[PDB]
Design a protein around this nucleic acid. Sequence first.
DNA 1: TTGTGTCTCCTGCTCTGTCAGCAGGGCACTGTACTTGCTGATACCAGGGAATGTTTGTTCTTAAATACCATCATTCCGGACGTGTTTGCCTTGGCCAGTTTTCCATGTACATGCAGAAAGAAGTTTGGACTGATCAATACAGTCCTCTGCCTTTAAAGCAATAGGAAAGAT
DNA 2: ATCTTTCCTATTGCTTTAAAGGCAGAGGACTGTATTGATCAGTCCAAACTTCTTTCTGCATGTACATGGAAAACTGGCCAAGGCAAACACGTCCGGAATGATGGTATTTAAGAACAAACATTCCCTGGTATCAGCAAGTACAGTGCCCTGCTGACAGAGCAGGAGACACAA
Lengths: 95, 95, 97, 97, 121, 109, 83, 83, 102, 102
Amino acid sequence: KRSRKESYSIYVYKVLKQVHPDTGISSKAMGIMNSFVNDIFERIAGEASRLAHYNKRSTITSREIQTAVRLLLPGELAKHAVSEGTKAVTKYTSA
Amino acid sequence: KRSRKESYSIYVYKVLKQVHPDTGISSKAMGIMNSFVNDIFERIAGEASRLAHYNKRSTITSREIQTAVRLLLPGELAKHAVSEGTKAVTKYTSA
Amino acid sequence: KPHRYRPGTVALREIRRYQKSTELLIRKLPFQRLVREIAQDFKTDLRFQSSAVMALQEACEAYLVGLFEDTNLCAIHAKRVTIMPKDIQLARRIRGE
Amino acid sequence: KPHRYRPGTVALREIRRYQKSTELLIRKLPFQRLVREIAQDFKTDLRFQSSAVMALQEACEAYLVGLFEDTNLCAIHAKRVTIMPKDIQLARRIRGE
Amino acid sequence: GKARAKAKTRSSRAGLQFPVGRVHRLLRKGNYSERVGAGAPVYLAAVLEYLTAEILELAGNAARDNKKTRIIPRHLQLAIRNDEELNKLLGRVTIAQGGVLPNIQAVLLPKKTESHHKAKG
Amino acid sequence: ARAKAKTRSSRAGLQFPVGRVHRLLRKGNYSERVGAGAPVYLAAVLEYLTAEILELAGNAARDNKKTRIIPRHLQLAIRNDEELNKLLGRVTIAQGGVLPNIQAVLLPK
Amino acid sequence: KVLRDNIQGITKPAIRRLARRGGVKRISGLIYEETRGVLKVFLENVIRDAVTYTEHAKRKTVTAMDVVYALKRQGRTLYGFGG
Amino acid sequence: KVLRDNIQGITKPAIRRLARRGGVKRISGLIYEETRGVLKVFLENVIRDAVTYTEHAKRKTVTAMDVVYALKRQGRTLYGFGG
Amino acid sequence: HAKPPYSYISLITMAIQQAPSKMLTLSEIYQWIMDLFPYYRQNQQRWQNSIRHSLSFNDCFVKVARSPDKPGKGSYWTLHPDSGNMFENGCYLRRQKRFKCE
Amino acid sequence: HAKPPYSYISLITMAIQQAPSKMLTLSEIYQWIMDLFPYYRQNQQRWQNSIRHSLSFNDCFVKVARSPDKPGKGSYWTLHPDSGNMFENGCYLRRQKRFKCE
DNA sequence: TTGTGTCTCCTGCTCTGTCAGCAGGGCACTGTACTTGCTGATACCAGGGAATGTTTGTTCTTAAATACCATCATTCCGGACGTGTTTGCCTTGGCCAGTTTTCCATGTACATGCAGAAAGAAGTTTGGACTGATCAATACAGTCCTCTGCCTTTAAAGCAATAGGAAAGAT
DNA sequence: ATCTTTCCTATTGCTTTAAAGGCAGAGGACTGTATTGATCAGTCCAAACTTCTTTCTGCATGTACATGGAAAACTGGCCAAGGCAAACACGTCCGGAATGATGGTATTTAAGAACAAACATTCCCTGGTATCAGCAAGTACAGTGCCCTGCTGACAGAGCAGGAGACACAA
C-alpha cells in the first residue's frame, strides 16, 4: 500500500467558503496555501520553543503562542491575530 | 555563593595554550569565543534535528553531525572538521 | 519607408509583458543539462526528479529577477539607463553576495 | 603665513584614525536617553540593564557603519565623493529595508 | 464509568475550522517542547485560520480584479506583495509560477517632449 | 570494586566536554534520542574550529605586538580569513571595529 | 521623568565620526537628518522586540539577553553579551 | 554521457527576458558573461547542499524536498513544491 | 498504435449499447475500452479522465443510481432516450450540434 | 497678374476686418488672399512664410486662442484695437509710423 | 526794372515690406501591437460509498507551574565639578551640476538555421513497504571528581610625557 | 626642489586592574545492569527515473543601419572642508534607594499515560463549470509628415520731407 497523504486542503477550502463562498481555488494554489501554513506553523512553534527555553518552561501554553504571534506578525496582523486567538481560547474554555 | 553559571572558558583556554602556549586572552574575548561556540553548537544541533525530522528518525548520530558540518562549514574548513570528527569518533570507539 | 520603432518602445513593451506574465523564461532542457553537469562534480551517476529541476529553475529565475531589479536601481542611481557589470558587482557587494 | 591643510587631507587622516580604533563613537548619555525615549512608548517605567544599553549602542554603531560604507560605495558608483540622502535611500532599498 | 458523553471535536468547541487535534499532534511530534498546553493548539489554529482568511480574502479580491474566480499563484503573489504587512512578513518568500508587481521607474519612461520630430542624433 | 572512571573527552582525546555536549543535546529538545558518537563528533568539530580561530587571533595579536587576545584581534582574524568571514558574515563583534580600507578613488593625486 | 526630544542627542560630529569610520571622505548637509531618521527606525524596531521578550518573561527590566534575541531574530547576531 | 559546455545554454535572449522582467530597459554586452557566472555560482551553491541532503538520506535520487530544504537553508524559502 | 478513428463519445455510446442492461460504470467502461482498443492501455490517468469529461459534460449521457446498494461505489450511466441518432451515418469523430438539455 | 498693389500687412488687415467674427486663422487668411487675388495662387510657400513672419512680428496683429477645442489646429488672429485706420485711403504699399505696443 | 518769397517738381534719407531660414509646439494619419470574444477542449471542485487510524472521553497520577514570601543587587536619580566637545562663525576652494560636444554600441528589424518541446515507447534502478532481528539508547542507582566561585597575586597594557621621523604644503 | 609646519609613530616610566593561580565543594558526569523499540538487514513492486527516436516549429543566432545614451571636457558657484573661539553638557565620582529579579517551599491543577469508541479524514467513482489554447475582431498608443507659432538678421523699394526751378509780389 501507499502511505497516507495528510494535508490542510479541506480546512483552507472551508475558510475560503466562509470568506468567499463563490470563489474557488486551484490545486497549485491549494499546495501553496499548505506550504504557507506549514511555514507559519514552523516559525511560530520554533519561536515558542525558544521562548520556553529562555524561560526554562517545559510546556508551551497559549501565552507562548501569543508572544510568538506578537513577535512575528507585523503591525495590525499581530493585533487582530491575538484578538482572534483570545476569542477562540475563551470560547473553548467556556465549554 | 550564587547559582552556578557554566561556560566553555577552560576548554578554549586549553586549546589556546595548545596552539599558542605563550599568549593569553581577555575576558571580553573569552565571552565572544563562548558566544561563538554556543552559536555553532546551536546551528549544528538545529541542522541535525531538521535532518532527522526529514528522515523521520528519532535519534541523532554522528552521521547527522557530519551532514550538518558539511552543510554549514564552507570549503576547506568543512573537510578538515569532518576529518577531525572522524578521528575523534574512531578513537572513542576503541574505548 | 518601412516602419521602425524608436529604441525604448520595444524594451518597455517587453518589460510590461514579462512583468504581467508569470511563465518561465529559461529553456528547460539546457537548464537541466547545466544542473546535471554541476551535480557531476559533487557526485557521479545521480538521479533527479522533474519537480526538483522545476523548483531549481523557479528559484534561479526569482533570484536573477531580484538581481536585475537591484542592477537597474543602481544604474538609474548613476544617471544611466544601461546596466553594466559594475552595477551587478555593486548590488552583490551591498547584498553581501 | 598660517599653515592650512588643503581639503580632504584631514578627512583621510580621520578615516585612518577611526578605522584603526575601536571605541564607541556615539556619546553614551544622549544615546541612552534616546533609547529610553523610544522605550517608554511601548510601556512606562521600563527598567534597563547597562549591558543592554551598551549592546544596543554596539549594534546601532555597527549597523550605521555598514550603512555608511554602502553609501560611500554608492556615491563612488555615481562618480561622486560626497554622500547624499539619495545614496542612503538606495543603500537601504538594495539591502531590503 | 459515568457513561461516555457524546464526543465533540475541540475545533467545534472552539468554533474554529482548522483541526485542533492535528495541530496538537504536530506540536507534540515536533519536539518543540517536553509538553504541549491544551489551549496552545487552539490559539495556534485560530491564528492560522485568521491569517488564511486574510490572505484568501485579498487573493479573491485580486482575482475579482482580474475577472477570475479560482485563486491561482499569481493572485496570491499580488495579494502578498501589494499588502505592506503581509509583504514584510513574507518578504524573503518565493512563490512558484509567480510574477512581480507592475512597476517601471519614472526615469525609464519615455521623455515627453513638446517638440517631437523624426529621430535624430 | 568500581574502577577509575575516565572522562569521555579523555577517551576521545578531546579537550571539549563530551558529557556537557550530550546533556545539552538531550535537554535541547532537538530529537527524542541522541547517539553516542554525535556529541563526540560535535565536540571535536567545535574544538577544531576554536583552535583555528585562536591560532589566527594569536597571529594577529603578534602582528599588533600584543600578548593577550582582544576583540579587535578576533575581528582581524575573522575578516582576514575568507572562510571564517563567510561563516560569520552576518555576525557582529563587539568592540571589533572594521578592517582598514580606503577606496582608491578617494586617495589624493 | 518624561523624555521629549532626545533624537537631537545624536550630534553632527558623532554622525561625521560614524561616516568616517565607514570610509566616507565628504559628507552632505542633509545626511544628518536622514541618518537620525534611519537610526530612530532601527532603534524602534529592535526595542519593540526587546520589550516583547521582556513582557513574556513578566520582567520589567530589559536584559542584555533580550536584546541579543531581538537582534538575532532580525539576522543581526551580536557576540560579546550572550552570557 | 559527460556534459562539458552547458553554461552556454543560458542564451542571450533568455538573459534579456530575465532583465526585462526586472524592468531593465537597456543592457550592456558584458552583462551576459557576468550573469552566467553569477547563475553558475548560485546553482553550485544550491546543488551542493541538495546533493548533501540526498546523500545523507542514503538515496541516489535528488527529490524536490531536498531542493526546498537547501533553498530554505539559504534563506530562499519556496512554496508550491510540498515544502 | 495511433488513436482509433472514434471519439470518446462514440466509444462510450458503443460501450453503453453493448451492455446487457444498457448501462455501465466508469470501471466497466475502462475495461471495455482497454479490451477493444490496445492504444488506451497506456496514458490511463489521461484517457480515463477524458472519458469522465465526456460522460459528465455531455448531457446525452444521464446517470442512474443503484437501488439495492449493488457493489456500491459508482453510479450507473445511461444514454438519454432523446439523444437519438447522433454518431450515426459516419460522424464518429464529431457530432454536429452537440446535444443540450437546457 | 502682377503683385497686387497691397502690402501683406494691408492684406491681413483687410482679411481680419472683412471677417464676420473680425478674426481669422492662418489657413483662413491664406484662403481669403488666394480667393481675392489670383496672383497669390502661385508661389504659395514664399508669401505664406512672409505672412507667418508678418503675423509673428507686427504688434498690430494679436493672436486669440480657441478655448473649447473648436475645429482646432490653429489660433485666431485679430487686429489690435489701437491700430485704427492705418492703411486707409491710398497708403496700401507703405504705412507711416508703424504701430508699436509700448 | 531787379531781387526775392512762395508754389511746384525732382531728389534722397526713412522707414516699412519682403525674404531666407532656424526653433518650439502641436495635430492627423498610418501602422503595429495588445486585449477581448467566440469556440473548443479539459481538469478539477463537489456529492456518494467504503475504510482505518486518529481524536475524544474517562481515569489515574505526579510534577510543572503558580503563588507567597524573603533577600540583595543593580539600576535610577540627584548633586557637584572638569574640561572636551559641540556650535557658531568666517574664509575660500574645489566638487557637483549644468552645458556642450563626440562617437560608438546597444537597439531594432529582418533572414537563416537549428534544437527544445512534446508524443511515444523501451529499459531499468531503486524508494519504499514488509518481516525478522538485534543492538544501541534510555532508565535507574551508586559514587566521585570537574568545573564554578572566592580570594590572592603579578604582570600586560593603558596613561602620561617626551622625542624622532614622515609627510603636506608652499614658492 | 628644498624649507617650514604639522601630525603620526614610537620609546620609557608608573600604575592598575585584569588575568593567572590556589583551594573548596557539588551536582552532574562516569560505571554497571536491564528493557526495549528504534534501528539495521534482506526481499520484492512498481513507478518513476533515465534513455532513445521523429517532427515542428519557436527560438536563437547572424547581419546591418543608426541614433541617443555613455563618456569626456570646461565653467562656475555654492556647497561644504578647514580653522578659531566660547559655552555647555557630556562624562566621572559619590551616595541613596527602590525597584525588582531571583531563591525556597507548598500546592494545585494541568497535562502525560493507557485503553475503548468512534467518526473524521482519507481513498476510489462521479456531474459540470471554471480555466487553457487557437483564430479573429476592436481598441489602444507610437511614430512621424506636416503645419502653426516665434524669432532674427538682412535686403528692396515706396513715402513724404527737403532742396532747386519757375513764377509772381514788392520796391
